[PDB]
Each structure stands twice: as C-alpha cells, then as structure tokens.
Amino acid sequence: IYLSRLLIDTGGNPDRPRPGRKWLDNIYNVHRRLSMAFPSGLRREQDPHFLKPFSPNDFQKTPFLFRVDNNIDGNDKRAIIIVQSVLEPDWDYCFQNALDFLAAPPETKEYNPEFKAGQLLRFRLRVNASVRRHIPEMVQQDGQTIETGKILHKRVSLTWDASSTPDQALADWLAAKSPKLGFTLQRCELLQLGWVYGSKPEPKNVKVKEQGQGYWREHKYNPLRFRAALLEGVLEVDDPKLFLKTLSSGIGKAKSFGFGLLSVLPI
Amino acid sequence: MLIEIHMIQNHSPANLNRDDLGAPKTCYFGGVLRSRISSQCIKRSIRTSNDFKALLGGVRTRRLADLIQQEAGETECWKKAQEILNKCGFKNKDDNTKMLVFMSKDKIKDLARIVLDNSLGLTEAAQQVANVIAQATLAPDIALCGRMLEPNDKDKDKKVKWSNTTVEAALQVAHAISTHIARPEIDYFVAADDVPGEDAGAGHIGESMFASACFYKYFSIDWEQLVKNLKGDTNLAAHTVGAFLLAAAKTNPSGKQNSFAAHNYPDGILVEFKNSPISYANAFVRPVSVVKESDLVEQSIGQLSNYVNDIRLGYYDEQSPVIGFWFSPNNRYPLGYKHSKLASRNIGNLNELVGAVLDYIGGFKWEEVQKS
Amino acid sequence: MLIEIHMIQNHSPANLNRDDLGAPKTCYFGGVLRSRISSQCIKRSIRTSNDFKALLGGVRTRRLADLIQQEAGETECWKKAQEILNKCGFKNKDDNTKMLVFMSKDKIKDLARIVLDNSLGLTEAAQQVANVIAQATLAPDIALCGRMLEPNDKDKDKKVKWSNTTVEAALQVAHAISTHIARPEIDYFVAADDVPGEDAGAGHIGESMFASACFYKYFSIDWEQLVKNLKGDTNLAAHTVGAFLLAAAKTNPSGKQNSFAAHNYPDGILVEFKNSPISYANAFVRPVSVVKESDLVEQSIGQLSNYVNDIRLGYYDEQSPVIGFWFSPNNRYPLGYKHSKLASRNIGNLNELVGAVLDYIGGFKWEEVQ
Amino acid sequence: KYFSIDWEQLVKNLKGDTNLAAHTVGAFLLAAAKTNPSGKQNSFAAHNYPDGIL
C-alpha cells in the first residue's frame, strides 16, 4: 500500500486569502477533495484539465484513511495530512487548479509493513470515542417542556465515571477490544480530547415547475459532529495475519472522516 | 502595591493549549518560534482548579434560562418571562445565542424571585432586572478577572436605563512563553522508508515519560483594585490572593488533574512587592539552547537571575527599595544566584511561602483565614 | 539647543496599538512590513502616566459643560451654559461638542464665574468664555504638545472674537516602528459555557490578533520655545524635561494589557544635545535578521551604534559640538561598535542619567524642581 | 531629488557680485542636505539625512 503526504501552510499573513487553510474547516470538504484525488479512467481522458462538472459516480469509491496533524518546520507552522489508501493516488490530477492549496508539493511512498511477534511498535492513533447506548433517548426537551417520552438507539460520545480519569477510561476502552484486533498495549497516554465538525449538502425536492422533469432540487445543509481522541503509546504484536488486516482497515467507526488511522513506528 | 509573580514551570505535551485546527499554540518572541499558553486558558484553569473551589463565585452562561429554570421551579421559567432579557436589551440575533453574562452564581435567587412574580408582568420587570445584573459583581473571580458586559445596539431603548456594569480587572496574566525554541514532534511518514533500529535513538530512548517544555509565566495582582472591587472585606481578598497563588502553583491548564505527584510544583516563584509592574520576559530573548534537559531548568533560572539582578540594580530608585521572596526545591542553586540580594527569605515549602506573602501584605497567615 | 532621546525596546506578545477592526497597526519601512505604534498613542500614554501626574494640568474634554457643572454645582446650569458653548464656535454638533478643546485645568473655575454672570450673559458671556479659552495655555503638557483649536463655522455672525489660539509645539514624536519584519498572529479564542447543555455544534471560534516586536522610539525636546511657552519658567521646564524622561522610560500603552501584560522596560536610551534634529531610524532600513549567537536587542544596538558613528563622522561641523550619553541597565548592552566608544559618558542607572541631563541643562537638580 | 544651478545666470542676476554667488551656492548645498519639509512633523517626525549626494 501507499502513504501520501500533503503539507499546508497554517501561518503566513493573516490578512490575505488563505484557501489552503480555509479548506481544513470542513472535514466533509477534506474527504470530498481526497475522493476527487481518485480518478476513474475515462474521466482523465474526457477531462484532462478537470473542468467538467464534478460527479461522485464518475470517481472510484475505494476506501482510504487519512489523518490531519500539525508540526513545526524550523520556524514555520505547518499542517500535515497523511493519506493511507490501497490504490495509487493521483495528486497531480486533484490540485492542478489549486496549486495554492499546498505550501509544498505532495509526496508518496510505498509501504510494505509486516512485523512478526516480538516488535514493540510506537503507535499514534486518533479514534472516534463513539458508543451506542441502550437508553440514549430521554428526549430532554428545551424551553418550557423538559421531559417527554420517546425511545430510539443512537450513537453518542463515550462517557467516563466521575471518580475515574479520562486517560484510564480511554485506556481500558481501547484495551477491552484490543485482543480482537491483535495487539497488547503497554503504555497508553491521552494527548487530546475534542470534537470534529463539518457540514454536508443534501438535495431536497421542492415543487415541480412547468415540466420540471423530476422536481426542483434545492440544497439543504445538515451538520456533522464527531468526538475525537488522539493518543500515543507502545504496543506489542501477536497473530500478524490479524495485525495486517488491522493495518489495512481502520479502528472504530466514522473511518471516512479522518478517524481510525493507526500509525506505527518499528522499534 | 503589587503582588507580581514570576514562575518557571514544565508541561508535558498531554497538557497544553490548542487552536481551532488542534495545533498547539505558538508565538514569536525575539525572532524565534516559541510555545505559548494563552492567558484565558490559564485564567480559567485557576477558576476550575480544586484549590479555588472554596470561593468559586460566578457563572459565564449563555443560557441563563436553563440556569434559572431549576432555581425557579415553575412554568414561568420560560416563554417571554425568560425572554425578558430581550426587552432588557440583548443582542439576540447579532450574537450567536444571545450574549454571555458574567453573573455571580449566588445571585440566581434574585432572578428567580423576579421571574416567579408575573403580577407586574414584563413592564417594570424588564428593567428592575438590570439593577440586579449590574450589582452582581461581589465575587472573588469576578473581582480578579473583571467583566465588561455591555447592552446591545437596538433593543436598549425601550425605556431602558443601564449603569456602569463594567468592573475593572485586578489581575493581569501574560501569555506564557517558553524559554527555548519549539521542539518539532516525531515524524511518522518516515516509517515506510527506514527504521530507527532495535530500541535505539530517534525512537525508544525512554526519556522518563515524554519531552517536556520549560515555560515562563507572569501574573500581576493589584491589591488596591482587588480590595475596592470587593467593597472592603480585606481578609477575603487576602484569602483570594493565597488561594490564587496556591492554585496557580499546582494546576495544569488542560485536564488530567494531578492527585499528588510533586512535579506539578513550579521550580521557581518570585513574589515581588513593587508599585510599578516590571516583566522579566526579556531574560529569554536569547534562546536557552541545550542538549540535556536536566539542567535546562537550571540555566533558565540562571538567565532569569542575571536579568533580574541587572534590572533591579539598574532601574533602582531610593524612594521605594523593595525586596521579595523565592521558592525552589532547594535543587537548582537557590543559594548562589545574585548573592541573595533580592532573595531575602529562601523558602522550600509552598504553605510557608504563602504564609510569608500573607505576613508581608497585611500580617495574616494562610492557616488562619479560610472562610468569609 | 535641542535635546534628543532615542530608545530601543523589546516587547512580549502584546497587541499594544489596535486598528479599528482589531488588528495591530502596521506600516511599511524599507519595503517590508513592520509593527507600528502611533505617535498620538505614545503621547497619550506618557501624558496620563504615573510619573507625569504631577504636571498634568490640562484636559482634552469633549463635554466641557459637564466639567463646568462638575465643579461649581448647580447642574441645571448645563442648560444655561451648553448653548453658550454652542455660540462660541462649537457648532452644536452631534455630541455636546464634537470640537475637542485643549485647555488648562484651572481656568474651568474661571468659567464658573460665567455661570454666575446671569446679568452679563448672552454675547458678553460668550465673548468672556472665548477670552478664557484663548488665554488658558500655561500647562506643562499643552506647552509640551500643540493646540490648534480652530472653532467650527456657522457660529454667531455678530461678535465671534478669537485670539491666536494656536500654540506651535515643543515636542515631536515619531511613529515607533519595529527593526524587523513583523509576524502578526491570531489568537483563536472561544467562549466556554459554564452549564452543560449548550446543544450548539458549529464554528464558534473567534479571531483576536497580536504581535511581538522590538521598537525604535524617537523623541525630541526643543529647549527654547518650551521655556518660551512656559513664560520664562526655567525650573518648570527642567522639571518637565526630567519627568518626561522618567515617564517615557517607564510607561507603556495600556492597550489590551489585562490579557497580554507586556510591561517591558527599554534596554537602551541615547540622549543627545545638538542644534539640528537627526533621526537614526534609517539604521534599520535593512531588517535585523537574528543570528544564533546573539539576540535581537544586541544586534539592534549594534546597528544603531554603526549608524550613529557614521552620522557623527559624516555630517560633522566644527562650530556645533555634539555630546551624548548612553544608558543601559548595569552596562548590560554597551553601545556596541568594535573598540570605538561613541557616547562621552556611559551611564548604568536611570535617575543618575536624569540628573546628568538636568545638570547639563544649566544647573538643575532632581530635588528642588519638584 | 534633483537640483540645477546656473552659475553665469546667477552671477548676471547678482550684478556680477561673485562673493555673494559663491556664498549662495555653498549655503544652498548646505541647506538642501539638512532641511526637510515641515508638513506634519510634530506627529510624523521624519528628520532624516541624505544617504548619497552627487
């Protein structure tokens, strides 16, 4: 598989238009752009310069994993995007009209990861602290109303006991499912605990005009909220046929919006 | 007249301050990139600290309706009875979910009292609430942080009067800057091309737990403004000063609260009693470069000592020659810098230092006053 | 003889002077962007400072009738006096009077007499008020600064009588500029709610700006024309020079100091005495890049010493001698230029240099002039 | 900045008084390198000196 690197300028003059920095405001925009970085054959031949209208059905729907972190390069702040996929990405076709998005040209390296039993890898990982509660619908109404009755099962953020710590709680949450994916954690240090926001358009059929031919479509924007937890540590390995499938896929839900990427450095 | 405080601390990357993109905050000081913790992060972490739990008077709430709802206990806790603030004058649509109010938490009973009576209706209740809002400033962290709450631009004309709601701050906190250049994090794109080795460098070094970062912090409490903010009650202001100092010594800005580790204690405090605020942040314009992190704090104290000696005998006037105190774990050469001209009392205990500060201010002691 | 003060200061991230939107004030010098503090901001910071509180005897009041009824009592005399102020040339603008008046702090009491002159009101009251406004200038700050006070037109067309209210100057202050390329920043602030249950997920982040820089300030006091504005009071002029030195050395603008707290002190002051004003701001036409061995302040002092020596051996005259001091705390930063010492007397203390300047001026000391 | 002075025309303007013409040229060259316009200098004090004169 391949790992790709994108560098975005975070500092610079703050009184100028910075479309590369503004692109990281919406994570759906990031996912859509990385999807546009995967042309589907005849799209390149029909549109080499990427000027015809964008169509999701004209691009491949292969999954990929990416992580957006931040760093300092000498005396400048930078945002690094690490893209892990299974097919060779084409960053030339994606940003060819948006060369000002990236401060530095993209990079790509072939990854051939395999580790037999006895490797103490150093890992970094940003998970989505999500859980499906059995009773997540109390219907806490607002205003004058405070308590009405309905029940449904929904995904919400992970919660911890008031007498415990978030670090230990997330450590045992990761260790509880850990033998299924094939690793043992020695140290688990919590580095961040926050949210990830985004917006998504959805077509809506307002009334048909004179021969509207399938209603009049109007965009309506719906929000997207995720609870993110970034953590590093040291982990061993066992059953490498399971760890390779763990590396190929992600960990936790919402894998298509920056979560689940496991970064491992051999030691 | 000032309780000027200069601190040198350490903070692991788990405990830091971040921005909208998740990056740690930075700044340029002396032309080089540094690490920064914002003042509002340090200011709030004192309020939410366990040491300041004793006083902790005040809520900065966008939703005053939900806060007053459990104090009212009646159907009248909403509708236009709790949209009364719009007739009082709020920027409801020019600001996202009204405007924040720095209201004292032990004053919601008065707001419940006014909202629970509807005999007078909204008339004369949309304006008598303004007096209670303006008078809700008797609070320790309201006195320290200071509020500014202002009326709106369009809804403050419906027979609406407002007094001076703004209270002057009695505490100034600087953006805590590091004493060295910002260390880059570990690259992870290099794992596909090479390996650091078998538990070797650029990798499994250990380095205790992580790579810390020295930080220089600066506080400036003015005693007169703090006393006049609380309308007398000099012992309560002394309790607030002692609690704030104890909180600022051993509080991490982010989560992961310490239980008892003794590494959260700062390695140096410089409590000074000037009448004009002086910052020693210019000690670290020259970056403190080193390979070994054990003596990094030691040479940081050395640079601070050199600069404080230079300033205190260069800008010295005979009218108010004042001296201060100093704390360290008797480790980083506390006896041997600047020949103890400023040091006077050298202290290795937190509570003893607080007692000394309270003795110099008014003659009190920390263990005596803990109540109103 | 002209007294010149050149300062070099370094500031922690502060946002001292702000634009109308909220950004720090910048400028261009040498083709690069620099952080800038305006002259009027520096003058107002010195004017209302602590060390200058003894000589403060003037008000820039925009609501002079409020001050009139604020001393003599009888607040109803506002609607006796304000319209009178509307007749002297204040146009009865949007505020009480949009024409800011600069006037000595004592003569307001004299205007109180105009309050009690109900028999001699109307035109006589307005003319007498104009006489007091025109003849109220003997103040150590109004003499230091200027006063234009050109009354707005559409006044009374009968007997609008005005003297020469213009008082020229005694002090020139240049816009303080950094010696390097400025790097402005944004402090992304958010307003955390206290009660859980906000139920708002969106972009609620904010943008507040700041910057850090090493500034070069340049003052200039004309020794004559300050005594002339002070009507021959040489001791008051000497006290004004000394206290101005004190305040300019130990005061910073009070802009967002409650959140940035950048009370930094200057690391070098150069005081010169010469017959023509020279500004050494052209030293930093080239931006001061920082090397690893030194810091910003040392390189700034080095380039300033280079330019000062080149000016000294350049535009040099035989009839006009130049004598200069050089201040640095405990000689931490000498006027670094190889083995060449430029100033005639290095000084390591502030009050010592104030006394040295004062006794050069003609025999004044920091004890009896106050 | 650019200045041009005609020597013969100045001498003819000064009734052939070469003592006044040389003094005028010298004091002009001195005053042109040490004087700046007075417009807005009490708030923008920019008393700079020339870096090169030909």
Side-chain angles (χ1 to χ4, degrees):
Chain A
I1 70 188
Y2 319 88
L3 329 168
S4 269
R5 172 151 125 172
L6 315 181
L7 257 79
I8 318 186
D9 221 43
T10 302
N13 196 354
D15 222 27
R16 255 46 166 173
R18 303 184 283 173
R21 170 151 222 283
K22 203 204 194 282
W23 170 51
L24 299 173
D25 85 303
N26 204 310
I27 201 145
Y28 174 87
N29 284 357
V30 184
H31 167 248
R32 196 197 243 158
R33 174 82 56 167
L34 300 180
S35 187
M36 305 186 351
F38 279 91
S40 83
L42 75 89
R43 179 86 210 222
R44 330 170 65 129
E45 288 338 285
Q46 288 203 355
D47 247 13
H49 278 340
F50 206 28
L51 296 163
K52 285 215 299 294
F54 162 71
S55 198
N57 35 285
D58 258 318
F59 288 105
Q60 305 175 330
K61 295 287 120 205
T62 74
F64 49 85
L65 302 151
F66 69 101
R67 177 159 55 77
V68 186
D69 37 8
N70 302 264
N71 225 28
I72 294 129
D73 286 43
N75 233 303
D76 268 45
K77 322 170 56 52
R78 291 300 156 81
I80 304 191
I81 298 187
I82 300 158
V83 184
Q84 187 190 76
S85 50
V86 85
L87 257 63
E88 177 191 20
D90 203 299
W91 308 108
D92 210 321
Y93 189 76
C94 190
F95 295 103
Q96 94 196 263
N97 279 7
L99 271 294
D100 50 289
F101 265 48
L102 308 179
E107 301 134 44
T108 322
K109 274 316 172 86
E110 194 108 13
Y111 200 19
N112 210 263
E114 77 277 60
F115 323 101
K116 333 164 300 311
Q119 197 101 30
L120 281 293
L121 295 138
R122 183 139 150 86
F123 85 100
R124 185 211 285 255
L125 152 74
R126 173 185 293 130
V127 280
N128 179 209
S130 76
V131 66
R132 200 172 280 277
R133 293 323 195 82
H134 271 198
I135 52 176
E137 191 56 85
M138 302 334 187
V139 194
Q140 210 286 110
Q141 279 315 115
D142 289 68
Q144 191 265 299
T145 51
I146 215 73
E147 182 50 72
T148 87
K150 206 182 74 203
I151 183 55
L152 48 92
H153 277 80
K154 212 164 63 172
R155 198 187 282 104
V156 281
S157 51
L158 176 71
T159 70
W160 53 88
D161 201 9
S163 321
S164 154
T165 89
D167 190 279
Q168 190 43 68
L170 262 171
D172 63 62
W173 188 70
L174 204 69
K177 48 170 78 179
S178 164
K180 187 253 199 171
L181 291 93
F183 44 70
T184 83
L185 312 149
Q186 281 59 23
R187 336 198 284 244
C188 163
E189 296 143 343
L190 187 54
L191 256 55
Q192 208 195 341
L193 195 49
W195 292 78
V196 161
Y197 293 99
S199 270
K200 185 189 154 127
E202 191 162 307
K204 160 127 71 192
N205 296 260
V206 317
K207 71 141 174 177
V208 188
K209 217 161 269 214
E210 331 166 82
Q211 224 263 343
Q213 204 78 43
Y215 286 77
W216 230 242
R217 275 177 325 278
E218 181 206 50
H219 269 317
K220 266 282 304 306
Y221 295 114
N222 80 311
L224 269 87
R225 295 128 191 177
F226 309 92
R227 173 86 144 169
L230 178 123
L231 56 98
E232 302 198 356
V234 173
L235 49 74
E236 213 210 25
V237 86
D238 56 329
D239 211 70
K241 20 196 184 295
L242 202 42
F243 200 63
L244 241 193
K245 257 203 97 162
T246 326
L247 261 172
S248 168
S249 194
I251 311 172
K253 321 214 189 349
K255 277 175 240 66
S256 192
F257 290 131
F259 307 100
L261 181 56
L262 179 66
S263 277
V264 280
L265 250 172
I267 270 171
Chain B
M1 216 190 331
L2 265 76
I3 316 110
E4 264 256 359
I5 288 151
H6 303 255
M7 288 188 37
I8 279 190
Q9 266 218 270
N10 297 65
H11 284 332
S12 152
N15 317 76
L16 260 157
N17 203 243
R18 312 201 120 81
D19 58 357
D20 74 323
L21 285 209
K25 305 272 207 48
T26 51
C27 77
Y28 287 87
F29 180 73
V32 291
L33 199 42
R34 302 269 172 112
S35 278
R36 174 171 66 96
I37 308 177
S38 88
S39 87
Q40 64 258 52
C41 180
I42 308 182
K43 270 168 117 144
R44 194 214 162 83
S45 274
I46 298 320
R47 268 157 34 84
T48 70
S49 194
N50 222 329
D51 276 281
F52 218 77
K53 174 88 212 162
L55 315 106
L56 201 40
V59 278
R60 202 179 276 114
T61 36
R62 252 195 176 97
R63 340 194 43 79
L64 192 41
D66 315 333
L67 161 63
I68 200 184
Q69 167 156 221
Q70 87 270 335
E71 196 41 65
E74 205 46 51
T75 312
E76 279 312 301
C77 74
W78 245 101
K79 289 208 210 321
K80 281 305 219 165
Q82 226 64 71
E83 276 315 284
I84 184 168
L85 324 170
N86 289 258
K87 197 185 143 226
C88 194
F90 255 41
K91 249 189 191 282
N92 44 316
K93 293 324 267 171
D94 289 71
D95 283 34
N96 235 348
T97 312
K98 325 300 173 196
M99 43 163 57
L100 288 108
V101 184
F102 201 26
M103 180 98 184
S104 39
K105 63 138 182 103
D106 284 3
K107 267 288 219 322
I108 296 318
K109 85 183 92 183
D110 293 23
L111 286 207
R113 165 223 55 222
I114 170 185
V115 64
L116 280 201
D117 198 65
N118 226 46
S119 55
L120 82 152
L122 226 59
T123 75
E124 222 267 328
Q127 201 43 50
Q128 152 250 333
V129 63
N131 310 358
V132 189
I133 273 280
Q135 264 94 74
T137 59
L138 167 42
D141 44 330
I142 289 200
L144 279 198
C145 263
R147 86 148 174 244
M148 90 143 278
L149 153 70
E150 91 276 30
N152 81 110
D153 224 327
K154 334 283 186 28
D155 318 334
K156 62 155 181 102
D157 37 17
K158 33 215 82 163
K159 178 153 161 263
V160 165
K161 61 157 201 100
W162 270 110
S163 178
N164 192 245
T165 89
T166 301
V167 75
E168 281 86 20
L171 160 86
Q172 323 199 307
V173 188
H175 283 212
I177 57 157
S178 40
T179 87
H180 58 111
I181 211 188
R183 297 264 272 206
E185 303 228 44
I186 294 303
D187 181 348
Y188 267 116
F189 191 45
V190 75
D193 307 52
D194 258 337
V195 47
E198 294 327 291
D199 45 81
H204 185 272
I205 186 71
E207 277 199 3
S208 178
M209 281 335 288
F210 227 89
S212 37
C214 215
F215 274 83
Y216 172 72
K217 307 215 247 163
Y218 177 55
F219 314 88
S220 278
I221 316 159
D222 175 89
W223 180 268
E224 304 301 276
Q225 270 271 29
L226 165 67
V227 163
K228 301 319 157 37
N229 273 353
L230 303 169
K231 203 195 55 207
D233 230 321
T234 85
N235 34 29
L236 196 91
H239 178 38
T240 317
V241 157
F244 164 99
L245 177 53
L246 249 177
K250 46 199 234 201
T251 312
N252 293 111
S254 75
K256 304 128 219 159
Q257 279 172 3
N258 161 49
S259 86
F260 223 56
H263 322 138
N264 227 321
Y265 285 169
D267 224 298
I269 324 282
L270 206 52
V271 182
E272 318 164 17
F273 285 92
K274 308 140 142 159
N275 44 69
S276 159
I278 299 179
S279 164
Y280 303 130
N282 271 338
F284 318 104
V285 177
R286 166 88 172 275
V288 182
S289 161
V290 76
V291 48
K292 274 139 67 132
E293 325 100 333
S294 62
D295 46 352
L296 164 67
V297 198
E298 174 140 9
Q299 63 214 260
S300 285
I301 318 286
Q303 295 211 10
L304 167 72
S305 148
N306 184 7
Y307 185 77
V308 70
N309 181 56
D310 270 342
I311 291 289
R312 285 277 268 165
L313 78 98
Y315 283 77
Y316 145 73
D317 81 308
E318 269 99 328
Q319 177 161 245
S320 42
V322 198
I323 48 138
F325 312 100
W326 156 268
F327 161 72
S328 201
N330 266 27
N331 185 216
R332 344 279 313 184
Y333 212 41
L335 171 58
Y337 75 87
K338 80 192 287 323
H339 258 298
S340 294
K341 297 308 283 197
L342 259 70
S344 210
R345 215 167 317 180
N346 273 91
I347 306 154
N349 187 285
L350 256 288
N351 277 287
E352 165 90 34
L353 175 134
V354 183
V357 173
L358 270 299
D359 170 88
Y360 205 119
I361 289 166
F364 334 115
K365 49 202 53 41
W366 167 242
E367 54 270 51
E368 166 216 69
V369 82
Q370 294 296 327
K371 321 106 182 199
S372 155
Chain C
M1 149 194 79
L2 271 162
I3 325 180
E4 311 206 340
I5 307 127
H6 312 251
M7 297 166 51
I8 280 197
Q9 215 156 336
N10 178 83
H11 275 118
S12 75
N15 183 87
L16 281 157
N17 202 199
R18 222 195 294 133
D19 209 277
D20 85 310
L21 287 168
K25 290 207 158 137
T26 70
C27 85
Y28 284 80
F29 183 77
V32 295
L33 185 80
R34 323 242 176 179
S35 270
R36 149 174 81 82
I37 311 189
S38 42
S39 310
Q40 56 260 351
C41 156
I42 300 165
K43 286 200 229 136
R44 203 212 148 75
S45 98
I46 299 160
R47 203 171 82 85
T48 69
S49 72
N50 212 78
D51 202 280
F52 220 87
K53 90 189 267 292
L55 314 98
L56 185 120
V59 295
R60 219 156 225 159
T61 296
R62 214 176 220 154
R63 39 182 87 251
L64 191 43
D66 229 331
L67 259 72
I68 281 154
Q69 82 203 275
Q70 212 220 55
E71 167 257 328
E74 278 71 86
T75 82
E76 91 268 338
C77 301
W78 197 0
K79 48 195 61 76
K80 134 95 179 166
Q82 173 58 40
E83 305 115 321
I84 285 187
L85 293 201
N86 302 152
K87 288 295 201 77
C88 289
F90 293 165
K91 220 178 178 272
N92 198 21
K93 288 168 100 79
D94 315 277
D95 216 299
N96 285 7
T97 282
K98 280 307 211 192
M99 189 86 228
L100 297 107
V101 64
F102 210 168
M103 155 181 158
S104 92
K105 252 211 299 168
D106 192 16
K107 285 281 141 308
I108 296 99
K109 153 204 307 158
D110 254 26
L111 288 187
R113 312 208 36 96
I114 269 50
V115 177
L116 53 99
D117 273 23
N118 269 272
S119 64
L120 312 158
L122 212 72
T123 320
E124 182 127 317
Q127 203 304 330
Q128 275 169 329
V129 155
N131 198 316
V132 202
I133 305 315
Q135 261 45 71
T137 322
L138 208 31
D141 51 344
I142 317 190
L144 248 195
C145 297
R147 169 187 148 185
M148 165 171 139
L149 161 53
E150 185 152 347
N152 293 121
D153 272 302
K154 317 302 197 50
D155 37 4
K156 53 192 179 140
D157 287 333
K158 29 179 215 163
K159 284 312 291 213
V160 55
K161 314 312 311 213
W162 270 128
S163 304
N164 177 83
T165 66
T166 289
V167 152
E168 298 165 37
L171 156 71
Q172 319 204 312
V173 184
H175 278 25
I177 53 156
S178 98
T179 86
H180 45 97
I181 299 175
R183 308 156 201 96
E185 311 266 339
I186 325 187
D187 173 41
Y188 290 104
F189 70 99
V190 86
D193 208 54
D194 262 296
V195 283
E198 181 43 58
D199 205 76
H204 332 117
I205 215 77
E207 302 215 290
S208 83
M209 278 170 94
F210 66 94
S212 164
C214 162
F215 299 92
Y216 169 80
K217 312 198 197 24
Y218 163 60
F219 308 88
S220 159
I221 300 280
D222 190 15
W223 172 241
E224 291 303 313
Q225 160 68 89
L226 171 56
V227 187
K228 176 164 59 216
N229 269 113
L230 276 173
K231 289 179 199 153
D233 209 313
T234 38
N235 261 322
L236 192 39
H239 179 216
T240 285
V241 172
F244 179 82
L245 224 56
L246 262 302
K250 295 182 307 132
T251 315
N252 327 121
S254 34
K256 273 209 160 329
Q257 295 280 75
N258 283 351
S259 158
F260 289 98
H263 315 284
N264 284 255
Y265 274 10
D267 277 352
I269 300 176
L270 165 77
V271 184
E272 302 209 316
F273 301 92
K274 52 223 303 194
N275 289 53
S276 90
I278 318 174
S279 206
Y280 304 128
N282 267 9
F284 321 105
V285 168
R286 155 193 309 280
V288 180
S289 276
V290 199
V291 307
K292 289 130 59 64
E293 297 84 72
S294 266
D295 40 355
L296 198 57
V297 195
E298 206 194 7
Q299 285 204 223
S300 296
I301 298 293
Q303 267 187 16
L304 178 59
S305 77
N306 222 69
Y307 196 79
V308 161
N309 173 255
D310 272 21
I311 286 301
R312 217 73 79 103
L313 287 205
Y315 303 86
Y316 166 46
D317 208 293
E318 309 321 288
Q319 166 283 15
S320 73
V322 54
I323 178 174
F325 302 148
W326 169 247
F327 174 56
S328 212
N330 202 24
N331 318 327
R332 170 170 240 245
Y333 291 107
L335 206 31
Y337 178 49
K338 33 166 170 79
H339 331 271
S340 292
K341 189 38 97 160
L342 270 45
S344 64
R345 196 173 137 192
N346 278 215
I347 293 191
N349 199 296
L350 181 90
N351 257 314
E352 165 170 4
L353 170 150
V354 179
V357 162
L358 265 179
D359 92 324
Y360 169 111
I361 283 319
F364 305 95
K365 292 308 287 177
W366 198 232
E367 283 84 359
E368 84 269 49
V369 301
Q370 336 186 7
Chain D
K1 306 155 75 186
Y2 170 48
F3 314 88
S4 182
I5 305 141
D6 205 9
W7 178 248
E8 55 246 80
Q9 174 76 57
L10 179 57
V11 158
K12 197 188 302 142
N13 278 33
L14 282 191
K15 320 289 187 330
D17 199 0
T18 323
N19 205 317
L20 211 37
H23 185 201
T24 317
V25 167
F28 177 83
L29 183 48
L30 266 201
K34 288 150 98 220
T35 324
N36 280 258
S38 87
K40 261 202 190 316
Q41 298 279 69
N42 287 334
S43 59
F44 275 113
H47 313 294
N48 291 262
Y49 271 14
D51 293 279
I53 301 187
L54 175 84

